[PDB]
Structure formats: C-alpha cells, structure tokens
Scaffold this motif. Structure first.
Motif, short mmCIF file in Angstrom:
data_model
loop_
_atom_site.label_atom_id
_atom_site.label_comp_id
_atom_site.label_asym_id
_atom_site.label_seq_id
_atom_site.Cartn_x
_atom_site.Cartn_y
_atom_site.Cartn_z
N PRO A 76 0.82 -1.22 0.00
CA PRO A 76 0.00 0.00 0.00
C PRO A 76 0.85 1.27 0.00
CG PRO A 76 -0.90 -1.59 1.52
CD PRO A 76 0.43 -2.15 1.08
N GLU A 77 1.96 1.26 0.74
CA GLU A 77 2.75 2.49 0.83
C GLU A 77 3.48 2.79 -0.48
OE1 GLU A 77 4.74 3.04 4.49
OE2 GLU A 77 6.20 4.49 3.73
N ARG A 79 2.07 2.98 -3.26
CA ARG A 79 1.20 3.95 -3.95
C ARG A 79 1.60 5.42 -3.69
NH1 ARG A 79 -4.83 0.94 -4.28
NH2 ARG A 79 -4.03 -0.67 -5.71
N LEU A 80 2.20 5.70 -2.53
CA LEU A 80 2.73 7.04 -2.23
C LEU A 80 3.97 7.36 -3.02
CD1 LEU A 80 0.94 6.41 0.09
CD2 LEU A 80 2.41 7.81 1.55
N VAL A 81 4.84 6.36 -3.17
CA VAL A 81 6.09 6.55 -3.91
C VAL A 81 5.72 6.82 -5.36
CG1 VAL A 81 8.25 5.44 -4.64
CG2 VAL A 81 7.47 5.18 -2.29
#
Lengths: 161, 75
Positions: A76-77, A79-81
């Motif tokens: 999920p994280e 998606r921030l990158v």
C-alpha cells in the motif's frame, strides 16, 4: 509488563499501530547508528545479522531489492512513492538513499521478521509505534525514528527479558 | 461536513470536508490543521489505504466517518 500490555490496532493487513507513552531509555538500550543516508539499513543489520559491521547494510539493501521484486507492486505504501518497480529499485539502490516504512514492510515479509518503528516527539518520549508483522515487542526488531530523519536500533533492557 | 481522523499518536481530530474532496485535498487540510506534511500521510478507511485522486464520495466516506492516519517515515 508495561511492554506486555501494549495495545496494537491492525489498521491494514499486517500493519499495526500503538500509542503508548514512555521514555525510550526506561525500557530499551539504544544502539546508535551512523548516517551517511544508510542508517535505516544499518539499524536492520544491527538486529538481524550476527557480527554486524559498517558494511553489513549492503546485505540488507540486497534483501530489500529481492523483497521489492516480490512485494512492491502490492505494498500500500508503494502507492505514495508512485514509481514503477524498476524506477523504485534504481532510487532505492542509489548511494545514501534513505530507507523507510516501505522498506520495513517489504523486509518483514522477505526476512520473516516483525519490525517495529518507534517514533519520538520533541519532548523525547515515544508517542507512537508502527509494526510490520504479527510478532510482539519481544520478538520484533525494534527501531527508533528520531528527528523525523534518522533510525537507530533498540534492544529491550535485560530486566524485561 | 465534519469527519474524524485518528492520527498516529492516537489523537482524534475533526476535519471540515466536502464529499467531492479528493484524498489529496483531505491531506492538505490535515497539513493546515495539524502541520503534518502531505508526503508523509497515508489515509486508511475500512482496512484499505485511500488513493490520492479519488474522492471521499468514491469511498462511501460519510459525515462523521473516522479515517486512520498512518505516517510514512523516512530516514
């Protein structure tokens, strides 16, 4: 005991949060790590690799690479990158490139470990922890995130087992 | 309309939002109210991390719903 009463809330699969309030040094030994941009991987190395040295972090970065090729697409994280896998790896593997909670999540799966990151406030006390993996604080690889920009390793003090 | 956000420290804050607000807009509001940089924020509802370009409406986030805020921590 204090440590045995931590209340973890699973916010997304395999990721938990807790907001205890404690002085880090009441319960943990801090094992300070150098920077040069590598302190996340040095901290992981300190707690996972026997006979750790200042070169051990290269091993952890390789495991991070391996982990990303398996897990990055579904993190999920990630998606921030917002990077393609290949662009992510190019940046991650760059000299002195900071590690993070994204690499902690992938490493927990790759290494078969639980990683907790305790973050400290300007008042010095721990105000929150994020845990990647299902293990408890006694099983976990515990990191201290400070200054919003630095990771050290922690070991539970001997009287708490 | 008012929604709630439980931050990483366990503080539950109120936020004023429109159903049409994108998650990117909600992050900007949290920055304005709590000072947390948008690049750090991961917003979570119903066990899923919300995407920047979707709206609260896209996610069935209603008046008085509670989001969890988890931070991306780098170092």
């Amino acid at each position: 005991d204090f440590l045995r009463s931590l209340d973890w809330t699973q916010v997304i699969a395999g990721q938990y949060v807790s907001n205890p309030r404690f002085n880090i040094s009441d319960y943990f030994e801090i094992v300070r790590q150098p920077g040069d941009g590598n302190c996340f991987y040095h901290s992981i190395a300190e707690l996972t690799m026997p006979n750790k040295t200042d070169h051990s972090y290269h091993y952890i970065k390789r495991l991070t690479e391996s982990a990303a090729r398996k897990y990055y697409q579904e993190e999920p994280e990630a998606r921030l990158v917002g990077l393609s896998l290949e662009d992510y790896l190019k940046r991650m593997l760059s000299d002195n490139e900071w590690g993070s909670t994204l690499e902690a999540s992938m490493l927990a799966k790759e290494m078969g470990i639980t990683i907790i990151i305790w973050t400290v406030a300007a008042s010095d006390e721990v105000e929150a922890g994020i845990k990647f993996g299902d293990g408890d604080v006694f099983t976990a690889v515990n990191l201290l995130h400070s200054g919003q920009t630095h990771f050290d390793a922690l070991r539970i003090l001997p009287q708490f087992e | 309309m008012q929604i709630f956000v439980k931050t990483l420290t366990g503080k539950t804050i109120t936020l004023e939002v429109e159903p049409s607000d994108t998650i990117e807009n909600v992050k900007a509001k949290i920055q304005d109210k709590e000072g947390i940089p948008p690049d750090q924020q991961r917003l979570i509802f119903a066990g899923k991390q919300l995407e920047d370009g979707r709206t609260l409406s896209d996610y069935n986030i209603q008046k008085e719903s509670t989001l969890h805020l988890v931070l991306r921590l780098r170092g």
